[PDB]
Amino acid sequence: TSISRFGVNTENEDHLAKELEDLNKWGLNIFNVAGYSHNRPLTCIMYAIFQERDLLKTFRISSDTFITYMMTLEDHYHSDVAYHNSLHAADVAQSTHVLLSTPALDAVFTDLEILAAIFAAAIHDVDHPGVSNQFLINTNSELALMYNDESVLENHHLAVGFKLLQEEHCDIFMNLTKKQRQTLRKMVIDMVLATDMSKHMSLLADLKTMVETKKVTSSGVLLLDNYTDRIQVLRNMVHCADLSNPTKSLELYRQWTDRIMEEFFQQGDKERERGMEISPMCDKHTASVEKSQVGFIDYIVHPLWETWADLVQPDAQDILDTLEDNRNWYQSMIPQS
Numbered sequence: 001t002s003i004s005r006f007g008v009n010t011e012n013e014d015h016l017a018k019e020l021e022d023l024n025k026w027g028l029n030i031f032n033v034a035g036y037s038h039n040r041p042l043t044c045i046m047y048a049i050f051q052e053r054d055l056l057k058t059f060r061i062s063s064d065t066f067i068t069y070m071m072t073l074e075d076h077y078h079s080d081v082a083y084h085n086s087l088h089a090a091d092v093a094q095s096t097h098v099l100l101s102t103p104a105l106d107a108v109f110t111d112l113e114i115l116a117a118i119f120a121a122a123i124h125d126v127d128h129p130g131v132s133n134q135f136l137i138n139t140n141s142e143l144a145l146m147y148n149d150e151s152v153l154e155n156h157h158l159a160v161g162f163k164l165l166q167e168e169h170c171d172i173f174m175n176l177t178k179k180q181r182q183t184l185r186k187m188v189i190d191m192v193l194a195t196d197m198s199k200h201m202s203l204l205a206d207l208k209t210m211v212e213t214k215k216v217t218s219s220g221v222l223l224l225d226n227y228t229d230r231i232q233v234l235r236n237m238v239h240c241a242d243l244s245n246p247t248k249s250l251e252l253y254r255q256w257t258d259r260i261m262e263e264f265f266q267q268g269d270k271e272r273e274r275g276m277e278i279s280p281m282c283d284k285h286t287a288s289v290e291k292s293q294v295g296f297i298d299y300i301v302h303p304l305w306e307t308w309a310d311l312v313q314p315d316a317q318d319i320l321d322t323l324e325d326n327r328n329w330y331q332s333m334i335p336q337s
């Protein structure tokens, strides 16, 4: 049916399989995957990642249950949102899947930790409406009321994602022990909340101390003795994945840039209509896309990736090199005097 081969029904089994040959690579093209999955990249990639990692066997999750949860999860991403839709979530899950296999980390995490990070990635933007926390707070929106102006979206994402486990044949965690569930749940909450950019400076600071204190085994594998160190590395890992667009090949990055700006400008138009001040970045009449990308990189993406790369030295060199090449491409495109 192919639904068993890929988790989704598509006449393009062959093309889809070709794209998935790069499941374990940074250079996977999730846009193509969306094309050949009848626009269900999340269900598809998660299915592929779960097969590659043996996680349905390990946690005793029937494909029925898995595919039903993922399709529901995917339907709760909004297709009319330009950036924060299932494709982005798919990208992040797949990117996290790759980061987990970094040779300096590959031995380090339990399957339950691997499960949690990848599930977190999948859920981390579900039911995103295409506007920032701040817009939500300033418009006295229902979600901001529900969450007291604090990580309003990131809280909602977790809620929706855990809530969907209760639908008919959707409980993918049924056959974990109660203790496994509790641990997984804590780890997921921590990772998804860490995706709020208001924590970025705080994760980075912590990541930096992991680097200043890094111990390695005789084989070269990072040594992370306790839960706190482990969850610190994973929460940063999921954050890196979330901020990975500029480390991908230029072709992929430019599309991510188009989409994020499309989403910002949609927000800016809603701000204009309501007579509010237009948030920075969100005014189509005045943004420099190119300079913005370079700032993004100079102040947020590169520092974070430079520190990740120190942690896993040299296992992220190629990612760092690509980011630098992409930075200089965006630089060269800035209009001059």
Ligand SMILES: COc1ccc(C2=NN(C3CCCCCC3)C(=O)[C@@H]3CC=CC[C@H]23)cc1OCCCCOc1ccc(-c2nnn[nH]2)cc1
Pocket (backbone or CB within 6 Å): 195, 197, 242, 243, 245, 246, 256, 257, 260, 281, 292, 293, 295, 296, 297, 299, 300
């Ligand atoms: C493909 O391009 C993106 C991808 C993602 C984003 C995001 N952005 N952000 C925020 C948005 C507020 C303003 C900038 C901070 C990042 C989210 O919260 C989003 C939700 C979660 C994770 C990242 C997402 C933004 C992307 O580019 C848009 C351009 C970003 C510009 O950023 C700058 C950063 C600092 C400087 C600066 N200059 N001097 N000192 N500091 C100048 C510019």
Ligand SMILES: [Mg+2]
Pocket (backbone or CB within 6 Å): 124, 125, 153, 195
């Ligand atoms: Mg988010």
Ligand SMILES: [Zn+2]
Pocket (backbone or CB within 6 Å): 088, 092, 124, 125, 195, 242
């Ligand atoms: Zn995200």
